[PDB]
Amino acid sequence: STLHEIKIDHFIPETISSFSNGTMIFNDKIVNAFTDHFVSEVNRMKEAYQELETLPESKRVVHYHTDARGNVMKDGKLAGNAFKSGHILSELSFDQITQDDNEMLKLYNEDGSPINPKGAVSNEQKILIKQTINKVLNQRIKENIRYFKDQGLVID
Ligand SMILES: [Cl-]
């Protein structure tokens, strides 16, 4: 029933710097922050993939390194939720990438394991992530202006 609200002086102004016809060009801070979020997601993926061998079986998190029953592999690909980006850039999670985006990024194998688990994320991958981020943010903000129109808040 209750609702908490935290007040903090952190705001990113001028989120959209310019317009290229219909598409929106976003402030560098936002693209950088979202790319940082996704590269941290990938780093977490690699960290958990290494933890699979580093940590003993008795210390594997139930939904992180493995599925709810304890199996590390389900069907052909990896089962744990650590190897999946289900909330930040879902379009780049191994279980739901268009094959073109995977071949551009070169980010996963067939069994869902992260490529180059010890190495960091490359810069080619980062610029492709920035492209995907621009596309996603454009679609999101168009959906949101659509909703604001539909709820009668904005009115012509
Ligand atoms: Cl699970």
Ligand 1 center to 52 CA (angstroms): 15
> Per the structure block, which two tokens stand in for 51?
């933890």
Taking each helix axis from N to C end, the angle separating 123-150 and 28-54, rounded to the nearest 10 degrees, works out to 120
Give CA 127 to chain center in angstroms.
Answer: 14
Resolution (Å) of this entry: 3.5
Contacts of 65 (CB under 8 A, 6+ apart): 48, 51, 52, 55, 72, 80, 82
Phi, psi of 73 (to 5 degrees): -125, 130
Give CA 124 to chain center in angstroms.
Answer: 16
Can you tell me the distance from the alpha carbon of 123 to that of 106, in angstroms, rounded to the nearest whole number?
12
Question: Cβ atoms within 10 A of the Cβ of 105, count?
Answer: 20
Can you tell me the distance from the alpha carbon of 136 to that of 89, in angstroms, rounded to the nearest whole number?
8
Residue among 95, 84, 101, 80 nearest 42 (CA): 84
Can you tell me the distance from the alpha carbon of 85 to that of 92, in angstroms, rounded to the nearest whole number?
7
Provide the sign of the torsion angle of the four alpha carbons 82, 86, 91, 94, taken in this order. Answer: positive
CA triple 44-50-54, angle to 5 deg: 125
**Residue appearing with tokens 């985006």:** 101
Helix (H, G, I), strand (E, B) or coil at 86: coil
Give CA 89 to chain center in angstroms.
Answer: 3
Ligand 1 center to 29 CA (angstroms): 34
Q: Which residues of 79-99 are buried (b: 16+ CB within 10 A; e: fewer)?
A: bbbbbbbeeebeebbbeebee
Ligand 1 center to 79 CA (angstroms): 7
Ligand 1 center to 41 CA (angstroms): 17
Helix (H, G, I), strand (E, B) or coil at 36: helix
Count of residues making up the chain = 156
Structure-determination technique: X-ray
Ligand 1 center to 67 CA (angstroms): 4
Ligand 1 center to 63 CA (angstroms): 5
